[PDB]
């Protein structure tokens, strides 16, 4: 339930970043941005708080909300994982501020984490701290946030979120099937990229938007069916991804599941290892949250009502890999009735099945 509101807020943010990155690759984490903004909520007061609660759909302070979030976190980091997913949130505030009495403990009570305190006048040092935090909480897979270059002796507050993902397929794509094939950029031009092939009974459904766009939808489960990737590919060229992403929801995903049946298909899917760093300011402003980024409008008085505080920098960075698993003369396979060759731009969603949370989301315009 909290999972659903968090996922959907996170999709809304994705929509906005998709709107601005037409025809560009973009990988993103709905769960991530919602997790960091849930925490931001506590630091927040006034109308800046209103903007965030209204856009999110819940108040972190209300009962059951934070325990649900920690529940979810712990579950994601459980033993089923296997270094497939690393996540981390963090808020850095100017070291010697007159913080309000009792805020730090209350924050730890709710998030089992702390607001990190740094002297931003050391600049290079503060940058190293932020970049180091991410490095050490993502098993070294994410090491640097280009956007940190923007901090200076004036930064009072920074917010970051970083996640890596590379899952192990329930059924891996035989290594010998992988081959170089043609991809059609929306550009109208083309590129040859490595693609995987696997013949199986995939959960499948044809889907239509209310406004009449058609997409093929496949479920690819990961080991133990804890996680699943859903792939959504237009029926023919010309069908944009927008029509789909603009109604995307957790409920929509469950809807796809409700209609899927298992059919023997040859699937041909491109390998991809993509990285994306997004500056969350504009996307978040576009969802109502504009006060937080504004020096004289921002209201962070739950954290410190002494110095005027406001968010200088809000970043998410995601790296995601899709290959044959987690790691020959012949290539043999069962013949299949139909084939599904994903040789054009497509969307993917990684879902946590037990809760429905949308962990990752993206559009691949070129692998």
Supply the key terms:
9-stranded mixed sheet, 14 strands, 31% strand, alpha+beta, elongated, Alpha-1-antitrypsin, domain 1, 9 helices, Antithrombin, Chain I, domain 2, 367 residues, 2 domains
Describe the protein's architecture and organization:
It is a single chain. With 367 residues, the protein is of the alpha+beta class. The protein folds into two domains: 27-164 and 275-319 and 339-348, Antithrombin, Chain I, domain 2; 165-274 and 320-338, Alpha-1-antitrypsin, domain 1. Helices cover 26% and strands 31% of the residues. The chain contains nine helices and 14 strands. It has helices at 2-20, 30-42, 46-56, 65-76, 103-111, 124-137, 242-245, 250-259, 281-285, and strands at 26-28, 85-94, 116-118, 157-166, 179-184, 190-208, 214-221, 227-234, 261-270, 272-279, 313-322, 338-341, 346-352, 357-364. The strands form two sheets. Strands 1, 5, 6, 7, 8, 9, 12, 13 and 14 form a nine-stranded mixed sheet that branches. Helix 1 packs across helix 2 (30-42) and helix 2 runs antiparallel to helix 3. The longest helix is centred in the N-terminal third of the chain and has 19 residues, at 2-20. It starts with a helix and ends with a strand. 38% of the residues are buried. It is classed as hydrolase inhibitor. The entry lists the keywords serpin, hydrolase inhibitor. The assembly is monomeric. A novel PAI-I inhibitor and its structural mechanism.
């Amino acid at each position: 339930y909290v999972a659903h509101l968090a996922s959907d807020f996170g999709v809304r943010v994705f929509q906005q970043v998709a709107q601005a990155s037409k025809d560009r690759n973009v990988v993103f984490s709905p769960y991530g941005v919602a997790s960091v903004l849930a925490m931001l909520q506590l630091t927040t007061g006034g109308e800046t708080q209103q903007q965030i609660q209204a856009a999110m759909g819940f108040k972190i302070d209300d009962k059951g909300m934070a325990p649900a979030l920690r529940h979810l976190y712990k579950e994601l980091m459980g033993p089923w994982n296997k270094d497939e997913i690393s996540t981390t949130d963090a808020i850095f505030v100017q070291r010697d501020l007159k913080l309000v009495q009792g805020f730090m403990p209350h924050f730890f009570r709710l998030f089992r984490s702390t607001v990190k305190q740094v002297d931003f006048s050391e600049v290079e040092r503060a940058r190293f701290i932020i970049n180091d935090w991410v490095k050490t909480h993502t098993k070294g897979m994410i090491s640097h946030l280009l956007g940190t270059g923007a901090v200076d002796q004036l930064t009072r507050l920074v917010l970051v979120n970083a996640l890596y993902f590379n899952g192990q397929w329930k059924t891996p794509f035989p290594d010998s099937s992988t081959h170089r094939r043609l991809f059609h950029k929306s550009d109208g031009s083309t590129v040859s990229v490595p693609m995987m092939a696997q013949t199986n009974k995939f959960n499948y459904t044809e889907f239509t938007t209310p406004d009449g766009h058609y997409y093929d939808i496949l479920e690819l489960p990961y080991h133990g069916d804890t996680l699943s990737m859903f792939i959504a590919a237009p029926y023919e060229k010309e069908v944009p991804l927008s029509a789909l992403t603009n109604i995307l929801s957790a409920q929509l995903i469950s809807h796809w599941k409700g209609n899927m049946t298992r059919l023997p298909r040859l699937l041909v899917l491109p390998k991809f290892s993509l990285e994306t760093e997004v500056d969350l300011r504009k996307p978040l402003e576009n969802l109502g949250m504009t006060d937080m980024f504004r020096q004289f409008q921002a209201d962070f008085t739950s954290l410190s009502d002494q110095e005027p505080l406001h968010v200088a920098l809000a970043l998410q960075k995601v790296k995601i890999e899709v290959n044959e698993s987690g790691t020959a003369v012949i290539v043999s396979a069962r013949m299949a009735p139909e084939e599904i060759i994903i040789d054009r731009p497509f969307l993917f969603v990684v879902r946590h099945n037990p809760t429905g949370t949308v962990l990752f989301m993206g559009q691949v315009m070129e692998p």
